[PDB]
Design an enzyme around this catalytic site. Structure first.
Site, PDB file in Angstrom:
ATOM      1  N   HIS A  88       3.966  10.876   3.749  1.00 50.24           N
ATOM      2  CA  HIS A  88       4.052   9.510   4.093  1.00 50.24           C
ATOM      3  C   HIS A  88       5.835   9.568   3.393  1.00 50.24           C
ATOM      4  CE1 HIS A  88       2.238  10.045  -0.344  1.00 50.24           C
ATOM      5  NE2 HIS A  88       2.665   9.364  -0.906  1.00 50.24           N
ATOM      6  N   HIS A  90       6.862   7.351   0.926  1.00 49.91           N
ATOM      7  CA  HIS A  90       7.045   7.592  -0.492  1.00 49.91           C
ATOM      8  C   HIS A  90       8.585   8.645  -1.091  1.00 49.91           C
ATOM      9  CE1 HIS A  90       3.603   5.215  -2.577  1.00 49.91           C
ATOM     10  NE2 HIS A  90       4.994   4.735  -2.303  1.00 49.91           N
ATOM     11  N   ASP A  92       8.743  11.174  -2.806  1.00 47.08           N
ATOM     12  CA  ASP A  92       7.905  12.349  -3.283  1.00 47.08           C
ATOM     13  C   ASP A  92       7.568  13.283  -1.668  1.00 47.08           C
ATOM     14  OD1 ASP A  92       5.942  11.027  -2.862  1.00 47.08           O
ATOM     15  OD2 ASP A  92       5.034  12.102  -4.571  1.00 47.08           O
ATOM     16  N   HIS A 153      -4.452   6.611  -0.309  1.00 48.32           N
ATOM     17  CA  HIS A 153      -2.614   6.423  -1.215  1.00 48.32           C
ATOM     18  C   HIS A 153      -1.692   5.594  -0.674  1.00 48.32           C
ATOM     19  CE1 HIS A 153       0.195   7.248  -4.083  1.00 48.32           C
ATOM     20  NE2 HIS A 153       0.812   7.893  -2.530  1.00 48.32           N
ATOM     21  N   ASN A 184      -0.755   5.962  -8.834  1.00 48.50           N
ATOM     22  CA  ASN A 184       0.131   5.303  -8.453  1.00 48.50           C
ATOM     23  C   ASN A 184      -0.583   3.861  -6.805  1.00 48.50           C
ATOM     24  OD1 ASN A 184       2.241   2.740  -7.776  1.00 48.50           O
ATOM     25  ND2 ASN A 184       3.460   3.984  -6.764  1.00 48.50           N
TER      26      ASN A 184
HETATM   27 ZN   LIG Z   1       2.787   8.426  -2.078  1.00 47.29          ZN
HETATM   28 ZN   LIG Z   2       2.998  11.291  -4.486  1.00 42.22          ZN
END
Ligand SMILES: [Zn+2]
Ligand SMILES: [Zn+2]
Ligand SMILES: [Zn+2]
Length: 233
Positions: A88, A90, A92, A153, A184
């Site tokens: 995804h 993000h 990380d 998520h 988150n």
């Molecule tokens: Zn994420």
């Molecule tokens: Zn994550």
């Protein structure tokens, strides 16, 4: 400290270092640490042997960590990483893509992930993966399946299955058993997330190992636990 064979935690991984953990023949997780809102968290990705090459799933959360990941792979495994997929948008998952690209790794993500990464100001994988735009969609990519379970998520989150090993890498759509919170949720779809997890359970009922985006791997129960945690939240 040293893990001495145990799954490593933040207490064994200073920010900037990476460890690998063998999950099955030709399957490893990679574990790194980095900072969010002033606190340090561990993060997992996946490495899958692809003949005499390696397929990487997710960066190690930033440029310094991702360079350390490449060095740790060369030390422990000694095969070249040739392709990477980010699950995804993000940091990380895509932070470190520029390091990978310069090191000759071809980087991939869905067009949804690429657009969201661009809009966020994050690093952007080079190549777009078609065939993942609707919930339940999947493609084969080298030795893995990439599956879009629906929003969870994040709206773009992918999961990865290694059929040869019955390993399901859930990324951040899946939480570890000790988790008490959905984490988150700024970009999450809390109402859809349990349905998306149900799709994963139905599509990969023979998974033997489930790896969360953060924390300890376990068995199939991580999926039900995640649905429970999210419903609770
Ligand atoms: Zn994420
Ligand atoms: Zn994550
Ligand atoms: Zn960065």
């Amino acid at each position: 400290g040293e893990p001495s064979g145990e799954y490593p935690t933040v207490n064994e991984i200073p920010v900037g270092e990476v460890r690998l953990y063998q999950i099955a023949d030709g399957v490893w997780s990679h574990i790194a640490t980095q900072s969010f809102d002033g606190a340090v968290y561990p993060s997992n990705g996946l490495i899958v042997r692809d003949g005499d090459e390696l397929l990487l799933i997710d960066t190690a959360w930033g440029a310094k960590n991702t360079a350390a990941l490449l060095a740790e792979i060369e030390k422990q495994i000694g095969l070249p990483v040739t392709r990477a997929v980010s699950t995804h948008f993000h940091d990380d998952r895509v932070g470190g893509v520029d390091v990978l690209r310069a090191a000759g790794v071809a980087t991939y993500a869905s067009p949804s992930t690429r657009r969201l990464a661009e809009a966020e100001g994050n690093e952007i994988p080079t190549h777009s993966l078609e065939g993942l735009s609707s919930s339940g969609d999947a493609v084969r990519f080298g030795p893995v399946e990439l599956f879009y379970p629906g929003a969870a998520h994040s709206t773009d989150n992918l999961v990865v299955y290694v059929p040869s090993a019955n390993v399901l890498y859930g990324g951040c759509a899946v939480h570890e058993l000790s988790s008490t919170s959905a984490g988150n949720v700024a970009d999450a779809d809390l109402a859809e997330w349990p349905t998306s997890v149900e799709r994963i359970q139905k599509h990969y009922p023979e998974a033997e190992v489930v790896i969360p985006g953060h924390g300890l791997p376990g068995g199939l129960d991580l999926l039900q636990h995640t649905a429970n945690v999210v419903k609770a939240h």
